[PDB]
Amino acid sequence: GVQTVTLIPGDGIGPEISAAVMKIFDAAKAPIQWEERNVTAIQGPGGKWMIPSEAKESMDKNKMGLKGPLKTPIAAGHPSMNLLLRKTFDLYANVRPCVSIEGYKTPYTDVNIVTIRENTEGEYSGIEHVIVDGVVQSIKLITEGASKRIAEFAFEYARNNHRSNVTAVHKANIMRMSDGLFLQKCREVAESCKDIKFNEMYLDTVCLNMVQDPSQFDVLVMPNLYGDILSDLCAGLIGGLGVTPSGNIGANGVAIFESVHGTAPDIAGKDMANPTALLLSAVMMLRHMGLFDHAARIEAACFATIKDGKSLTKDLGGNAKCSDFTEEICRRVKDL
Amino acid sequence: FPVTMLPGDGVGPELMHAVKEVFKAAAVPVEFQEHHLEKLEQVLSSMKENKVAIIGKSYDMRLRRKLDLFANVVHVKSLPGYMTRHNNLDLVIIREQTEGEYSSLEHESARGVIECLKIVTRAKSQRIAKFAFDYATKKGRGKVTAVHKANIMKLGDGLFLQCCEEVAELYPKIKFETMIIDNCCMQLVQNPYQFDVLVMPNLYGNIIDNLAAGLVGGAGVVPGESYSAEYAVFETGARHPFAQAVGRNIANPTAMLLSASNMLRHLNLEYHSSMIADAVKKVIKVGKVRTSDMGGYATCHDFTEEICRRVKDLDE
Ligand SMILES: [Ca+2]
C-alpha cells in the first residue's frame, strides 16, 4: 500500500533539498511516507562509536533510507560519519550510475557507466602502524568473502538492470596477491553468469581510456580505493557531484541512497540549492523498491526540466531559485 | 655525448629506433650505449659514467631502486594541432616513485585473507616535496598542489601531506594548495586548468599520470622524466600495461621524441632540443601525417620519416 522510507536530511542545504524531494514525490503521488531521523554520532559509553538508536531502529524496520549531505564533524576523535553508517548497516556495495544529462552540455556525451565499488576493505581499512621513527605502514587487505560478495553483486546488478558487460578494474600487476584474489573471485562469479560479458582491465589504463572515450564501458566493479576515486572521475564527465546519484546496499535488505556533494552552507537557506542529485538517488530508491512507474515519471520530468533550460539553479549556470526548479518538476509530473 | 639506451618491452625497441633516426637527421652529437634488457650492474655502471639515459618499458623497480630515481616528472601539455576535449592545457605531475605499495609486501594472514603493506617514510616524502618546489621555481611555475587521501590514511598520507607543508614554507614565492585525490580526479576532467604542479605519492601518480595523459592526447604523445640526485632517465609519461605494446609500425613516436628533446635540454644541447621539439610540434600542427592513435592513418616510420624531412630542412 504505502511505503515508509527513512529520511536523513542532514546539514547545510540538506533539509531544503529533502523537502523538494518530498514535495516532488507528493506531486507524483508516490506511495512513500517519510520518517525523519538524524544520524549525527552521539558520544558512546566512554568515547564516540555509535549513531542514534532511533536511527538504527528506524532503518532496520523501513529498510530503505534517503540521506542528504552531512557536515564533516569537527570533534577531536570524531570518525567519518559515513564510516559509522557503513559499519552499523554493513553497507558493502556503493553503486554510482553516471549518465550524461541531455540538457547539460558537457564535453562528454553518450556516457552510461555504472561503477560498483567495494565498500568494506581495500586500502580504506582501519589499520595503520608507525613501524619506526619516520616510517609509516598502511594495511590494504582483500578477503575472498568480501570480493566474491561484491563480484556477485555486480553481476546481479547487470542482470536486473539489463547491462551487457561487467569490467573488473584492478592493479593486480603491482599488487599481485591482494588484487589478484579480487580478480580471481570476480572470474569465478563471471564463469557462473556467462549471459554477462566479462573482462578485466587495469586501473591506470581505464582512467586513460575513460577520459578519451567513455562510451566503451558498462558496469565496472573494483576494490574500495579504486572505486572511491574512479566514481568521482566519471561524475566529472557528466556535470559533477551536483547531479550524480549514489546508493549503498547493505545487510538485511538495508539500502541507503544518498547525495555525495558537500553540505554547501554558503548558499544554505537561500533557496538556491540544486536538489537533482538527491532526487536522482531517490529515483534509484524508488526503482530498488519496485516503484518503476513512479520512478520513470519523476526521473522523466526532472530530465525534461533540465533539457528545457527555463528553470535552472545558479550552480548549473541558471539564475532561478530551487523553489522554482522544484515547482516546474512538480507541475511537469502532474500531467503524466 | 654518451647516453644509456634501454629499448624495453613491446614497441620500445621500435620507438627508440625512431629516436636514433631523428638524431641522425638532426646531427645530434650523442652516442647511445644500447644495453638491451644481475644485468642491472652493467647498466648501473653505464649510468654512473653517463649520468643520463633514455628508456622504454618488484619488476623493473629494482632498477629505480638501484639508481634511486625517486622523482617522476610528467609534462601534460596540449599540442597545437592535436585537438582534444581539453586544449591549451599545461600541467606537470611530480610523483614519488619508490615507496607505497610497489615493493610486493603481501602475505596471507588466514585462508583467503590477503594483507598488502603500503610504506611511506618521512625521508622520501620530504625529498619529493623539496624536489617539487625546486622544480616549480626552476621552471617558473606558479603553485604546487599536494594530492592525498589524508582523511582516511591519516598516518601515511598524513605524514606525506605534513612534510609537504613543511617544505611549502621555505618556498614562499609559490602558492601551495592541497586537494583530495578523488576530488582532484573529478576536477581534472571538469576543469584541469585550475592546476599547475601536482605532487603525490606513488599510487596516485599512477592514476593521475594516465588520467592527465588522456586529457592531452594519450600515451602516444605524453612524455616523462625520472630524476635521481645524480641521474636523469627520460621515458614516456603514461606507463599503463597496454600503453603502446599493441602493434608494429603503428606506434606513435611523438612521446619519446619530445622526451628525447627534453633529454637534450638536460644535456644542455638546448639547440637540438628546441629544434627537434619544434619539428615534432609543427608536423603535428600541419596535420598531414598522423598515426592511428591520433585519428590519422599513418605508419610509425611514415610519421618518423616526415619528422626527419622537417628536421633536416630546419638544419639547412
Ligand atoms: Ca568519494
Residue numbers in the entry:
A (entry chain A): 3 to 338
B (entry chain B): 15 to 51, 61 to 80, 93 to 351
Copy the relevant paper text.
Human NAD-IDH is a key enzyme in the TCA cycle, which catalyzes the oxidative decarboxylation of ICT into α-KG. The α and β subunits form a heterodimer (αβ), and the α and γ subunits form another heterodimer (αγ), which are assembled into a heterotetramer (α2βγ) and further into a heterooctamer (the heterotetramer and heterooctamer are also called holoenzyme). Our previous biochemical studies demonstrated that the αγ heterodimer alone exhibits a high enzymatic activity and kinetic properties comparable with those of the holoenzyme and can be activated by CIT and ADP but inhibited by NADH; on the other hand, the αβ heterodimer alone exhibits a low activity and cannot be activated by the activators but can be inhibited by NADH. Our structural comparisons show that the αβ heterodimer has a similar yet more compact overall structure compared with the αγ heterodimer and contains a pseudo-allosteric site that exhibits substantial conformational differences from the allosteric site in the αγ heterodimer.
